[PDB]
Subunit: 234 residues, 4 copies
């Protein structure tokens, strides 16, 4: 494929363009609620993922070409307690048949299987596990729950976060930024990532999130909108 | 969904974005060959269809809104004999789980089942069946192999045909045009079509084609490229 | 330039993106009224033109490349008398400094100067002059008020006409279609046009219209919206 | 206007889409060289600006609506000496008739006139003047050479910088990021900026740059490509 694009200003309650996995659902107001909410309150031990229906052609073995892509999405992570939060939300790419992996700190993306899984993620990590830096962080993750690069992230409870992720194929640069319009505060991180080596030719793209494994480490992970475009020169 | 787009300047030999049904395949040079070719020669009794992976949201029961869409594709129909041709090629919309229907003059789109099937097609018909006008034609077909409107079509054997189809939701106008750049000859037809009444909320879009049911009524039906865009106001 | 696009769903009353020439104005409801209207009634001897502010790079002498482009616009031509009409409306390309040429049957586009002017137009001609066929027509015009190709055009008084014009650089094919959603009636014409030979490298694009030179040959020429895109491979 | 877009993968040597002011020129290889280079070496006391030909409709007094916009551009600033650099490069919006203002630290954008000029800029400042913080910085500037917000910027001599600027009208958030693909290092800054209050309804957008006012404070300021899109809801 050469060019694929799609833009949701909000999500449809029974989405056919979006493959919902685990606890993910679209609320009737059109928020993509990745992790469970009960009586308006986030629940623990939740794992939800959402992928776009069409696979994306990110590289081609015949032509040796790599896709470029850009995506925008806004998301909210709201926790009943500012200091106890887990586990986070991520935008990711994985093989098209990708299924939910471990919950909790593995973010539904990775596992501890000793079989290195193919998934490239931009995580917004709200809990410091063994493999994390100390502070909440935006991480670029290449086939590991351990980020290859991260920036410390001043998570704002319940505030809309605007994210813009792009991948420039000609330089192998993956760049992720987050901005909180509420107080015009922003964070960015970039990495040199070889998508040909990390991922298969075709992938599915989307989001994954998990709530903490305890009652006092719960938060929501809602996506409010999403735009994506990818071009493969071919 | 609000906006979905995709553009192929040619097709990938093992397409993941394109669901190939019946005899459809992508050749190694990237043509979408809907009907069978053997030793470079079209074969009879063939039926092939290709659909885009992502369903398209063409209308919404809650918001009462209808999508607009536009698509461009180029296609070749080549017959070893100018005067004996069958059966044709079509661009269509159908429920997402749509499967190949009858072969031959039914174009893989419709059947004679007495169970009116949901499919809206723009056919390029190369054989005059019982339900057709006399001459080869471009037809707009709403849940029937019988066109509600058609224009006579001067098919050019083996020449590239450029098609542009659009649907204007605000007026319910479906317009289909074909141009042969080789001699700058063009045909157009339009119809007032209520997609809400003809189709379910979500559909898949693509192409369907069949070769004749006899050895002396064979032709190819190759699509060379394809661009599509649909917006649902919501 | 490689890609230029712009889309108006209606026009701004004091447009800065649109260079208005002669009698052209934008009404407060956002219609581009090319020719004069007085007390709601079309006036004779009027000439109005509108061009997009940015020049469009349609070909390049260094790279030998030609642009492709596509444009959509809706327009109304309303005459107080169905049988007496003049003169018409056109979409055109001309050098960027292009100024209004002759009025009346020259459509503000051409003149009788014996100095062949550079302008390539798709005219919707409502009056049969000396150089016209008999019937109202959609014409493709290459540096002459005389069309190189035309299709007879069933003008519908006061009805919205939807036009789609495209130019495919790889085949030099200019295609123009018009559809009246009101009764789903359509017309199309195509021509092999060498834009490199007809036009300079850079042009401005837009509309031109004139009302008849007599009181009993008056009509309006309003454009309701306009989308344009052009890509030059370079 | 509702939607305006344009994308250059490089610039044309005699650009008609781009209004070049002061010393700005396009090199024969298609770089937009804002400030003077002599025998391949940057010259002092230079000031160059480039604007897109079409004005952009950023807000509308009648409808009370504000545009959103996004733009990407890559740029190089190369100095013969790493530690002596001046003055910088900026992306800006200003009234359409905007002309070059003061040189040097005023970046061709502002002056010391005591007549507050309308210009909103995202500067990449390479020299600490009286109104600057100490370190080189990316600044958001609203009708002043003094930034309202800035982030410290690790300028990389002679390296390609990729910038992405967006403005979200619904939150009044202007966000600017820079990434050096060479070592995947990134910077971002955001501000709450009211474009209705800072700028007139229509503007022109582009770049401005100046070299230092001394021989030992020289650098280049070349833009390599540029994409822009703006939508005004209206
Ligand atoms: Ca963690
Ligand atoms: Ca038939
Ligand atoms: Ca005439
Ligand atoms: Ca400075
Ligand atoms: Mn982490
Ligand atoms: Mn038929
Ligand atoms: Mn004529
Ligand atoms: Mn500064």
């Amino acid at each position: 494929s050469e060019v694929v694009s799609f833009s949701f200003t909000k999500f449809n309650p029974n989405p056919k363009d979006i493959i919902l996995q685990g606890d993910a659902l679209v609320t009737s107001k059109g928020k993509l609620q990745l992790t469970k909410v009960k009586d308006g309150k986030p629940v623990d031990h939740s794992l939800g993922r959402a992928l776009y229906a069409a696979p994306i052609h990110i590289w081609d073995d015949s032509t040796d070409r790599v896709a470029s892509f850009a995506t925008s999405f806004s998301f909210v992570v709201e926790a009943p307690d500012e200091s106890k939060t887990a586990d986070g939300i991520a935008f990711f790419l994985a093989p098209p048949d990708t299924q939910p992996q471990k919950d909790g700190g593995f973010l539904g993306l990775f596992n501890d299987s000793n079989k290195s899984i193919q998934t490239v993620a931009v995580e917004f990590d709200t809990f410091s596990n063994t493999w994390d830096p100390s502070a909440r962080h935006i991480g670029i993750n290449v086939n590991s729950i351990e980020s290859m690069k991260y920036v410390k992230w001043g998570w704002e409870n319940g505030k809309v976060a605007n994210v813009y992720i792009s991948y420039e194929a000609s330089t192998k640069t993956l760049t992720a930024s987050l901005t909180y319009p509420s107080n015009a505060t922003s964070y960015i991180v970039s990495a040199n990532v070889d998508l040909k080596s990390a991922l298969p030719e075709w992938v599915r793209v989307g989001f994954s999130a998990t709530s903490g494994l305890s009652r006092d480490h719960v938060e929501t992970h809602d996506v409010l909108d999403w735009s994506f475009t990818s071009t493969l020169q071919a």
